[PDB]
C-alpha cells in the first residue's frame, strides 16, 4: 500500500500517493461560511464549504485562513481540510496509508506534536512522519549540497546543506512571503481610487499580482523610465466588466522582498539575507555554496526575480567567486516532488513512526525521531 | 410523488367528468327503457317522475352551456 | 487480451439493468434525460418542439422522489456524523427542485393550450425549465459523492447490513495528476487585457463515468 | 388537507389551493356603498357590495380601496374582502386549511402583526405563514439566482437573490405603479377635452390604459412622428356610445416609470433602480445578475417594456458584459404560482405558524419565523 | 436610519427629506454601552421613546432606532458591510506597531470629527477596547468637547508657526516644476 504525501501549506494543499511525480490534489487552503440571510428554503441546510467549492462562490461566503505564518491557528477547520482531502480529493481510506506531513523549520514545538495526535487518534493512519520544507527542495534538485531559498505564501527561510549534512545555526527564517505581498499591492492600488475591503476581493488582488507584477532589474532606472513615458501601463479586467490600468505599482509590489522597509519591517531584504547565511558557514565550505542557489515556491514566480537576485549577490561577493542560481521551471511544486522521492525511499521504510511506537510514548516521539 | 403533483389531480378532474358524461347516458338509457314497457307498475310512476325531471334540468344545462362557447 | 476484455462489459453491462435499485444505475438514467433538453437548445437532439421538454421534465422529476428515498435510508442508518450531516443538506434540495419542475411544467403546458404554439414560439420559454433540470443535477452528483463516501466510512457499522451500498458494488478511480506548468501559447500576446481566469465547472457526466463495477 | 394560497395586493385578489398550477378566484379589491336616494321598497337593503359584484354596479357606488401603497388602510373593509373569498369565491371553511399570505419588503411591521391576528382569531385557522410577494416570483421561474423586478398597483420594488441567500441591503422599494399611471393619464386626456372626476370613471380609464397604451422605445423619436403625421391615433368607446381619440398619450403614460419627474417625484426611473441596486452587490456576483433578470407584476404587461428595459440597462453597465430580460407570458401571476409551490412543498411543512405558538407569543410570533 | 424608519410607517425618500432625517439623528440618537440589555428593555417598557416634529407640523415617534442606527459604527454587518467595527479597527492598528510603543498608544487615544459626538461612545469604546487588551494595561480615551472643529483648530496652528514658511510652495516653484510638486513637499 503506497504513503501518502501531503503538504500542506499556508495558501495550497498538495496531496498525492508516492512514487508519482505530481500531486493529485491542488485547491485553496480555505473554509468559508455564509454571511448573508437565506429566504429559499432548503438551500441553506450547507453551512461550510471547504476548496474549490468556496472559491466558487465567493460572493455570499467569508473566507477565512487556518494557516498564517506556517503555523495552524484554527484547529477545527484545519481538521476539515484533512478529511476534504482524504475522502474527496482523493478517495482513499486514510486508516490504512502512511502519510508523510511537512513543517517548515523554527515552527512552534507543540505544533508538530497537534499534527500527529490528530493523525493518529482520528484518522487512525497505520504510520506517519514529518518532514522540512527546505530539505525535501534538495531531493527535487536532484543534489546533496546548495543553499535552498523556500519563499512560499506565509514563510520564507533558508536552509543550507553540504554533503548531506545540515547547519542549524546558520538556518535563517524571515515571516514575508506572498500574503504580505498581496496586502501591499491592496493598499498601493488605493493611489488611483481603485479600493477593494472585503475578503472575496482579497482572491482579485491575488489574481491580478500573479499576472501583472516582476521584479526590475534596476529600481531606480525604473523609476525614472516610468514616470517619463507610459510603456509600463497594462490594463486588467475584474469580474463584472470594469477595466483598471497599472502603472510603476507593477514592479513596486514585487520590489519590497529586497526593502522589506516599505512594509514596516526593519529586516534585510532577501539578497541579504542569503548572504549572511552563508558567511555564517564554514570558510571551507563557502567555495560551492556560492553555486548550487536553489529557489522554490510560489513566491519565487516573478519574472526577472533570479536575474536581480545574482547581481545583488555579485556587488558582496568577492569578484573571484562564481554566482549560479538554480531556478526550475516546475518549483512551485518542489516541496512535494521531494516528498514522494523520500517516501519512496528504500532506506526511508525502517523510521516511520508506527501506531505501537505512539501508545507507549504519546506525542512526544515525533521530536527524538521526526526531523 | 415527494410532493402533491397537479398532473394527478389534473387526471382525476378528467375522469370526474367522464363519469358525470357517461351517467346522464346511463339516465336517458333508465328512461327510455320504463317509458317503452306497455305494463305499469304502482312503484313504477315515481321513478319515472324523477327520471324525467332530472333528465330535462340536465338537458336545459348542456343546453345553457353549449352558448357559452359563441360570441 | 482480446478475450480478458469481454469479462469487464459484461460486468459493466450486468448493472445497467438493475430496475433502478441502485443510486449509482438511477443517476445515470437522470443525466442522459438531462443531456437530450441540454442538447434542445442547439435543436440536434431527440426533441422536437415545446412539448417534448415539458415531457422530459416529468421524466426527471419522478426519478427525483425515486433518488430522495434510495439517499434517505442510508442517511437512517449512518451514525451521527459530518457525512451523514453533508448528505442530509443536498436531500433538502433534491425536494424544492423537483417540486419546481412539476408546477412549472404544468404551467408551461396550460399556456401552450390557451395562446397556441406561438406564444411559446419563441425558445425563451423552454430555459425556465431547461435552467431547473441542471440544477437539479448538480444535487444529484453531490449527493451520490457524499451517499457512497458514508458507506465506505461506515461499511463495517452496524445499520448497514441488508444494504445496496455503493460501498459493495462500486469502485473510485485515482484522479488524474495535475499539470506541473501550464503551457504558454502565442494567443495572449494579441490580447492586451489580461483577464482573470475562468472557473472550471464539472460536467456531470465526468463526475459520474469514475465509477467503476467491482 | 388542501392549504389556502392568498395573494392580496392593492388592485386584485387572488386565491386558490396549494398545489394546484392556476388561481380559483380573481376578483378586484373593491368595496362599494349605495350614494343615491333609494325609492323602490325593498331593493335598499343591501349596503355593502365587495367584488365582481360591486364592479357591475359603478353607476350608484362610490368604489374604495382597502389597500393603498401596499399597506392596508381600512382594517374593516379588509375584513370584508378576505370573508367575501372564504365562503363566495372559494366555497371552503377557513377552520381546516392553513392559509398563506404574501406582503411587499420595507412595509411597516405592523401591517403583518394584524394581519395575523385577524387570521387566527376572527376566521380560525389552523396554520399560516407571510411571505415575500418578490421572493415568491423567483420559485415560479424555476431559478434561485437573479433579480426580481415586481411592480404591481400600488408599490414596485427590486430584490437581488444568489443562490438562495438574500441581499437585505441592496432592496430598493419605490412607491410608483398602475395606480399612479392611471392618475396621470386622466389629467393628461384633459387636453383634448374629455373629463372623468368619478370614482367609477376612474375604472373606465384604468380600462382605456391596459388596452391602448405601450412604451416606446425612443421617447424623443417617437413625439417626432406623433406631431409630424397621425398614424398612431387610435379610437376607444365610452359604455354610453360616444368615442373618444387618443394621439401621443398612448406612449406618454408609460413613459413616468423611465422618467419619474413627469409625476413630480424627484426618484429616478426604474431603468437605473435596478443598475443601482446591481452595483450595491458582490462584485463577484453581479455577473450572475445582470443575466436572470426576473419581471412580474401586471404594469409590466405593456408591450415593448422588456426591449426598452434592456437597451436602457446596456447603456449603463460594462459594454463587455450581456443583459437578459425575464418575460414570462403569465408574469401577472407569478406571485401566486410561487406560493402554490412553497406551500405544497414537502420540506416547507414544518415552518407554519400553528395556532399554538400563536398562544404563547402573541402577534409577534411572525417576525421571528416568517420574515 | 431612513432604512430602518419605514418600520413605523414613516417614509422619506427625497433628497430635502435627506436633511430632515439627519437633523433627528444629531438630536435622538446615542450609543448603547451593553447592546443586548437595551433590546430587552425596549421591548419590556417605552420609557425610551422620544418625539420629534417635522417641518408640516406633523410629530413622529422613534422607539429603538436611537441606538440601533450608531450601533452599526461596532457592528458593520447590519448594512452589510464586512470589515470590523471602529473598536477592533482602533485596537489592530495598535498591534501593528512595535510593542516598545504600544503602552503609550494604549493612552492618549485621541477621537475628533462630528461622528464622535453620540452620547455614550466615549464610555462604549473603552469597555470594548479594554476587552481585547491585556488586563495589565491602561486605557484612557480623550474626548474634547471642541473635538467638531479639531482639525481646523491644528490648522491655524501649524500654518501661523514661526518655522513653517520654509516649507510654502510658492507659485514660481509651482510654474518651473507643475502640479506634481505637491507630492513630495506637502504631507
Ligand atoms: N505566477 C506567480 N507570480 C507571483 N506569485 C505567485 C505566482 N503564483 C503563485 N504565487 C504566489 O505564491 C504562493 C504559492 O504558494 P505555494 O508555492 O503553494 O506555497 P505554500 O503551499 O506554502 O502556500 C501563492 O500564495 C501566490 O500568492
Ligand atoms: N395588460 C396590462 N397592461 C397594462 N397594465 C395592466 C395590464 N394588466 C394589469 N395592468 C395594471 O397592473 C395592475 C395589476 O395588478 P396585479 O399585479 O394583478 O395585482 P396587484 O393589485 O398586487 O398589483 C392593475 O392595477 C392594472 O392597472
Ligand atoms: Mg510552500
Ligand atoms: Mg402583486
Known amino acids: 500500500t503506497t504513503a501518502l504525501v501531503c503538504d500542506n501549506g499556508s495558501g495550497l494543499v498538495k496531496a498525492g500517493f508516492a512514487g508519482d511525480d505530481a500531486p493529485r490534489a491542488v485547491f485553496p487552503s480555505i473554509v468559508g461560511r455564509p454571511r448573508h440571510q437565506g429566504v429559499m428554503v432548503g438551500m441553506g441546510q450547507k453551512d461550510s464549504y471547504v476548496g474549490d467549492e468556496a472559491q466558487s462562490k465567493r460572493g455570499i461566503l467569508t473566507l477565512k485562513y487556518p494557516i498564517e505564518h506556517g503555523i495552524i491557528t484554527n484547529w477545527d477547520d484545519m481538521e476539515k481540510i484533512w478529511h476534504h482531502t482524504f475522502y474527496n480529493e482523493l478517495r482513499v481510506a486514510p486508516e490504512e496509508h502512511p502519510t508523510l506531513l511537512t513543517e517548515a523549520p523554527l515552527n512552534p514545538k507543540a505544533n508538530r506534536e497537534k499534527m500527529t495526535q490528530i493523525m493518529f487518534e482520528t484518522f487512525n493512519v497505520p504510520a506517519m512522519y514529518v518532514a522540512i520544507q527546505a530539505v525535501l527542495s534538495l531531493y527535487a534538485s536532484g543534489r546533496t549540497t546548495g543553499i535552498v531559498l523556500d519563499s512560499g505564501d506565509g514563510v520564507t527561510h533558508n536552509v543550507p546543506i553540504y554533503e548531506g549534512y545540515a547547519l542549524p545555526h546558520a538556518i535563517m527564517r524571515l ?39 516582476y521584479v526590475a532589474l534596476d529600481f531606480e532606472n525604473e523609476m525614472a523610465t516610468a514616470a517619463s513615458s507610459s510603456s509600463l501601463e497594462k490594463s486588467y479586467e475584474l469580474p463584472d466588466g470594469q477595466v483598471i490600468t497599472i502603472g ?33 558557514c564554514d570558510i571551507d565550505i563557502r567555495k560551492d555554496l556560492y553555486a548550487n542557489n536553489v529557489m522554490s515556491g510560489g513566491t519565487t514566480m516573478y519574472p526577472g526575480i533570479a536575474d536581480r537576485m545574482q547581481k545583488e549577490i555579485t556587488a558582496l561577493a568577492p569578484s573571484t567567486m562564481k554566482i549560479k542560481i538554480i531556478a526550475p521551471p516546475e518549483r512551485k511544486y518542489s516541496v512535494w516532488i521531494g516528498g514522494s522521492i523520500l517516501a519512496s525511499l528504500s532506506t526511508f521504510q525502517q523510521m516511520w513512526i508506527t501506531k505501537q511506537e505512539y501508545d507507549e510514548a504519546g506525542p512526544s516521539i515525533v521530536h527524538r525521531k521526526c526531523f | 410523488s415527494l410532493s402533491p403533483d397537479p398532473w394527478k389531480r389534473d387526471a382525476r378532474e378528467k375522469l370526474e367528468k367522464q363519469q358525470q358524461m357517461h351517467i346522464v347516458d346511463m339516465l336517458s338509457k333508465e328512461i327510455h327503457e320504463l317509458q317503452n314497457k306497455v305494463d305499469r307498475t304502482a312503484e313504477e310512476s315515481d321513478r319515472l317522475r324523477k327520471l324525467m325531471l332530472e333528465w330535462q334540468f340536465q338537458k336545459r344545462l348542456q343546453e345553457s352551456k353549449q352558448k357559452d362557447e359563441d360570441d | 487480451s482480446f478475450q480478458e476484455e469481454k469479462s469487464k462489459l459484461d460486468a459493466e453491462v450486468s448493472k445497467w439493468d438493475d430496475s433502478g435499485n441502485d443510486i449509482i444505475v438511477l443517476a445515470k438514467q437522470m443525466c442522459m434525460i438531462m443531456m437530450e433538453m441540454t442538447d434542445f437548445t442547439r435543436g440536434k437532439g431527440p426533441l422536437k418542439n415545446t412539448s ?163
Not at chain 3, 434517505?72 to 443538506?89: E, F, N, V, W, Y
Not at chain 3, 431547473?132 to 463516501?149: D, F, I, P
Not at chain 3, 461499511?155 to 459493495?168: D, R
Request: net charge positive; with cysteine; aromatic share 6%.
Open chain 1, 175 to 213: 515571516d514575508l512571503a506572498g500574503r504580505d505581498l498581496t496586502d501591499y499591492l491592496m493598499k498601493i492600488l488605493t493611489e488611483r481610487g481603485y479600493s477593494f475591503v472585503t475578503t472575496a476581493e482579497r482572491e482579485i488582488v491575488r489574481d491580478i499580482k500573479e499576472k501583472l507584477c
Open chain 1, 248 to 280: 510603476n505599482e507593477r514592479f513596486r509590489c514585487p520590489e519590497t522582498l529586497f526593502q522589506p522597509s516599505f512594509i514596516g519591517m526593519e529586516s534585510a531584504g532577501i539578497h541579504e539575507t542569503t548572504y549572511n547565511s552563508i558567511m555564517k
Open chain 3, 52 to 214: 417534448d421538454v415539458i415531457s422530459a421534465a416529468k421524466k426527471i422529476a419522478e426519478a427525483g422522489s425515486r433518488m430522495d428515498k434510495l439517499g434517505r435510508t442510508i442517511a437512517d442508518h449512518c451514525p451521527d456524523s459530518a457525512c451523514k450531516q453533508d448528505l442530509l443538506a443536498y436531500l433538502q434540495r433534491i425536494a424544492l427542485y423537483c417540486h419546481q419542475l412539476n408546477i412549472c411544467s404544468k404551467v408551461k403546458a396550460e399556456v401552450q393550450n390557451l395562446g397556441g404554439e406561438l406564444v411559446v414560439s419563441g425558445v425563451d420559454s423552454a430555459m425556465s425549465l431547461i435552467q431547473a433540470a441542471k440544477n437539479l443535477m448538480n444535487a444529484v452528483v453531490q449527493t451520490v459523492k457524499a451517499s457512497y463516501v458514508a458507506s465506505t466510512k461506515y461499511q463495517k457499522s452496524q445499520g448497514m447490513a441488508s444494504l445496496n451500498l455503493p460501498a459493495v458494488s462500486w469502485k473510485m478511480k485515482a484522479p488524474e495528476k495535475k499539470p506541473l506548468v501550464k503551457r504558454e501559447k502565442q494567443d495572449e500576446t494579441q490580447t492586451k487585457i489580461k483577464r482573470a481566469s475562468q472557473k472550471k465547472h464539472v460536467n456531470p457526466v465526468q463526475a459520474l463515468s469514475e465509477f467503476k463495477a467491482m
